[PDB]
């Protein structure tokens, strides 16, 4: 019964050429990366846009035709059938003026909206699993158009998804978009650029859930940009642990799994960096790409960001409490954010996050939770974000001490 997009992470690929790196940068090349994508346990890919768009020219934009530099309609149908065999879903980005400065054009809004409307049934017939539209701050009467497009997509099948993206970070603006659209999945800047205290992140997360009836939602730092656009390297591991264990669908962009940072090499486009598969990525700068920046190098190191991403994604896509669970937060100290995930009679998870730069005792208070919950004296450590602890062994909960920037994931069974 549970909808497919509830079952794990979504993975955005906006620039097909930069993702592939080598060769031609087409739909065929993407198909040859599906074994890698399956290794990440991601449940859906968000692709493109890939349609014909003469920059700023409404008449020479056609959402029904693939731009021949990306490949053919036969290459697209082959990509969909191979993704299906690997249990990976496919979402098509239809943002119409993707090659221009304004994504929605500057004129003829009724003509532009009709292009999106008329492309929905065409692509659902081809076998896509849903759609993404971005930059909806620039779309006039967005809440009405989104309701219409949702009703067409769900009318085809309740197992089809519409994702909307906005640059907004404002709670009131987001609430007014969703008021008549309560089931839409929305990505936004709600969590980016508010300074990062443990207490402030706890306030953002709790107030959002309290305002929206604990309904299903996404968790992300942006509608499109990399985590390293917003966060220093020392908080990346902590944020991945939080995103994979909050109640909702986590959404990443290509390279987030290796900590891809556009600033870390000479010559990377700041908003669309080349994916670093191995040390041969940029042959014109010998010595610049080190092994620890790359997919090949990170796959050989149990302590890497990619190894952590893979483990967390595994847990998110198999543990019923992380799939379906309720959520309750503690009010821990300055520096800390801590919470529990729990469902019916399945294994429970405790998450403890130290956002600060000093070592801390957690002194978690049981009475912060509702009367009917309770904690055991000890819980088995599943993992830490930092090396050197004994996994699989119990830790005593009244006594936890966390190092600077450390996150812990603990587990405990259903006891009646």
């Amino acid at each position: 019964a549970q909808k497919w997009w509830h079952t794990g992470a979504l993975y955005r690929i906006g620039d097909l050429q930069a993702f592939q790196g080598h060769g031609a940068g087409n739909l065929a090349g993407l198909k040859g990366r599906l074994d890698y994508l399956s290794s990440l346990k991601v449940k859906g890919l968000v692709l493109g846009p890939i349609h014909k768009n003469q920059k700023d020219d409404v008449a020479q934009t056609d959402l029904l035709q693939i731009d021949p530099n990306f490949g053919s309609k036969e290459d697209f149908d082959s990509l969909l059938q191979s993704a299906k065999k690997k249990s990976i879903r496919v979402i098509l980005d239809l943002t119409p003026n993707y090659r221009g400065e304004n994504s929605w054009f500057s004129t003829q809004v009724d003509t532009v909206a009709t292009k999106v409307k008329d492309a929905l049934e065409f692509w659902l017939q081809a076998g896509v699993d849903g759609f993404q539209v971005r930059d909806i701050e620039n779309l006039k009467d967005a809440s009405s158009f989104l309701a219409e497009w949702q009703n067409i997509t769900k009318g085809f099948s309740e197992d089809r998804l519409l994702i909307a993206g906005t640059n907004s970070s404002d709670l009131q603006q987001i609430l007014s978009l969703l008021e008549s659209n309560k089931d839409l999945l929305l990505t936004s800047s709600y969590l980016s650029d508010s300074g990062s205290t443990g207490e402030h992140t706890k306030s953002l997360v709790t107030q959002y859930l309290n305002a929206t009836g604990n309904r299903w939602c996404s968790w992300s730092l942006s509608q499109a940009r990399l985590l390293t656009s917003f966060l220093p390297a020392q908080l990346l591991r902590l944020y991945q642990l939080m995103l994979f264990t909050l109640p909702g669908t986590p959404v990443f962009s290509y390279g987030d799994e290796i900590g891809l940072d556009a600033a870390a090499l000479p010559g990377q486009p700041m908003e669309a960096p080349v994916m670093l598969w191995d040390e041969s990525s940029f042959p014109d700068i010998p010595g610049a790409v080190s092994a620890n920046m790359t997919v090949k190098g990170q796959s050989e190191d149990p302590g890497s960001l990619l190894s952590l991403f893979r483990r967390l994604s595994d847990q998110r896509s198999k543990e019923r409490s992380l799939l379906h669970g309720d959520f309750h937060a503690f009010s821990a100290g300055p520096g800390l954010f801590s919470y529990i995930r729990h469902w019916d009679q399945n294994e429970r998870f405790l998450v403890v996050l130290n956002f600060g730069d000093v070592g801390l005792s957690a002194g978690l208070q049981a009475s912060d939770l509702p009367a009917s919950a309770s904690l055991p004296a000890k819980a088995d450590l599943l993992l830490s974000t930092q090396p050197g602890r004994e996994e699989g062994s119990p830790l005593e909960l009244e006594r936890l001490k966390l190092e600077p920037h450390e996150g812990l994931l603990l587990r405990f069974p259903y006891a009646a």
């Binding site: 600033a263 486009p269 700041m270 041969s280 014109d284 010998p286």
Partner: protein
């Protein structure tokens, strides 16, 4: 996919003078199969500094503007078989490791240079060509000479990009 050219198609600058090639070069053009394209953001310009050492190696420093600060990376180019060819030093000896060849194709030392790069990883080869300038801008004619050579090695013109000049960091 575009296969690497044989090294027998790649010219070597005659009579190469290592002491004239030293100093700062701006990366004015980049041609290869990396994902960069003429129809989209080509990136910000960076500099490559060649410091000649007593054993005829170069210490090579890359200088660029990162998020809100200047950024640096350093490596050693070890002389190869002929004057004007180099390899990358301080490389691992595990059997899957990447190796490099650098060949200076054409330079007048005080204005422009074209350099060819080849990587080898297991059985797989990668390549690029760079257009260097002593200044951040070069003439239409010199850029066309670089376009013509890159195309002769099998690259489409849309695989050739010209990074945007900036003033942060790259002018010491």
């Amino acid at each position: 996919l575009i296969p690497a050219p044989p090294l027998s198609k790649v010219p070597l600058q005659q009579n190469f003078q290592d002491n004239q090639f030293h100093g700062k070069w701006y990366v004015v053009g980049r041609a290869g199969n990396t994902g960069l394209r003429e129809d989209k953001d080509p990136g910000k310009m960076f500099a490559t500094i060649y410091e000649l050492k007593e054993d005829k190696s170069y210490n090579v420093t890359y200088v660029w503007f990162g998020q809100k600060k200047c950024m640096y990376s350093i490596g050693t180019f070890v002389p190869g078989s002929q004057p004007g060819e180099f390899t990358l030093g301080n490389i691992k000896s595990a059997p899957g490791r990447t190796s490099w060849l650098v060949r200076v194709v054409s330079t007048n030392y005080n204005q422009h240079a074209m350099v060819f790069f080849k990587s080898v990883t297991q059985n797989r080869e990668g390549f690029a060509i760079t257009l260097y300038g002593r200044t951040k801008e070069l003439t239409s004619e010199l850029k066309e000479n670089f376009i013509r050579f890159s195309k002769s090695l099998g690259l489409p013109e849309n695989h050739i990009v010209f990074p945007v000049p900036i003033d942060q960091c790259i002018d010491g």
